[PDB]
Design a protein around this ligand. Structure first.
Ligand code: CL
Ligand code: NA
Ligand code: NA
Ligand code: NA
Ligand code: NA
Ligand code: NA
Ligand code: NA
Ligand code: NA
Ligand code: NA
Ligand code: ZN
Ligand code: ZN
Lengths: 213, 207
């Protein structure tokens, strides 16, 4: 049985593999290549409690300076087999998370996209909203929405930490007994699917959520 | 103070090496490796400009500090963007000439930023399973082609930008055509394109 890994761990493995390939291609310093080779081997190896023969072979191929694009493709495809994809909730569970939102519905998602997703986010332009759903560390379905500005700028996304097309996302806290609430937020990728593909550390996502208060 | 003119792919390359350096600062804990990457990055950027100025000098100084921040990076990218000569969209009359056989042809609307990062312009017409591509050759002449783009999407390295992407088989428009896999989304393709020679080689290997 293949070890199960999370989508963000797959994204991380892909990231370090591509970083290594770029070092092979463009960095002429022998000792630097060795340092990055070792770092990459460790970065990938540490994800698994347990590496099997296929991963051992992939690592061997990765550690060769003649690593090719075709070889990378094959290795990425192999690593994808280990991923447990994001599980879209049933309509009844989704509605329980957004009890005050009538008629709510999550757009269809391609299977690869669920394999790289730590959360699912979609925009409803009519209401200028982004909806976000995810599971917490206890595997409970959670959801929120906020206003997403129409203005898009270049900046680093607060969730994935990559330089991207971002918009200001503002969430209202639950309204207290006196009708008062806090409204906080920050810039995040307008396109949450691309955001998820860029997300290699899920703690960044959870930190974003917590910062909304 | 006139700004040295650079090409969109050169800006993309500069952005690429800056992000690479930041990731080394953040994740690679080896003093000598950091210094090597710092020096390479400095050289990569300096060599693109040749003629620099006080703004570039200041940007390089900030980049060379291991405390480089995201906010500083965004500021530097915005400054460097000011040096780029964007892709020039052709007038409709000129576009017509390039595609004489195609009627009612019209380029989509493109954002200003997207033109600053574009070495070519590509768009899809799903009704005909077609991708159109326009570009300027090395003699600055406007050129265009189109072909069938498969509806099948796979993960793989793009023949144009050389990055791992969502690619589809493109066949330039009986006979056998093997095709080449390229990004379905040409705007994203362009953003990933840091070496113009890869694009030209792709063109050459069609025609
Ligand atoms: Cl290769
Ligand atoms: Na990394
Ligand atoms: Na790479
Ligand atoms: Na890299
Ligand atoms: Na790269
Ligand atoms: Na590079
Ligand atoms: Na990175
Ligand atoms: Na790391
Ligand atoms: Na080039
Ligand atoms: Zn993001
Ligand atoms: Zn491409």
């Amino acid at each position: 049985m293949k070890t199960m890994i999370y989508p963000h761990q797959y994204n991380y493995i892909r990231s370090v593999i591509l970083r290594l390939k770029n070092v092979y291609k463009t960095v002429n310093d022998k000792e630097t290549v060795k340092v990055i080779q070792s770092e990459t081997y460790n970065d990938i190896n540490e994800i698994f409690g347990h590496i099997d023969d296929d991963i051992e072979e992939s690592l061997k191929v990765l550690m060769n300076i003649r690593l090719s694009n075709k070889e990378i493709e094959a290795i990425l495809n192999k690593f994808l087999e280990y991923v447990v994809p994001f599980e879209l909730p049933s309509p009844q569970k989704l509605q329980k998370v957004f009890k005050k939102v009538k008629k709510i519905k999550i757009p269809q998602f391609e299977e690869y996209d669920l394999k790289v997703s730590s959360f699912v986010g979609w925009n409803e332009l009519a209401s200028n909203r982004k909806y976000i759903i995810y599971y917490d560390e206890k595997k409970q379905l959670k959801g929120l929405y906020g206003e997403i500005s129409n203005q898009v700028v270049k900046g680093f996304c607060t969730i994935c930490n990559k330089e991207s097309n971002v918009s200001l996302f503002m969430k209202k806290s639950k309204t207290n007994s006196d009708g008062q609430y806090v409204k906080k937020g920050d810039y995040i990728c307008r396109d949450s699917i691309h955001c998820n593909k860029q997300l290699t550390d899920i703690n960044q996502f959870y930190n974003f959520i917590d910062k909304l208060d």
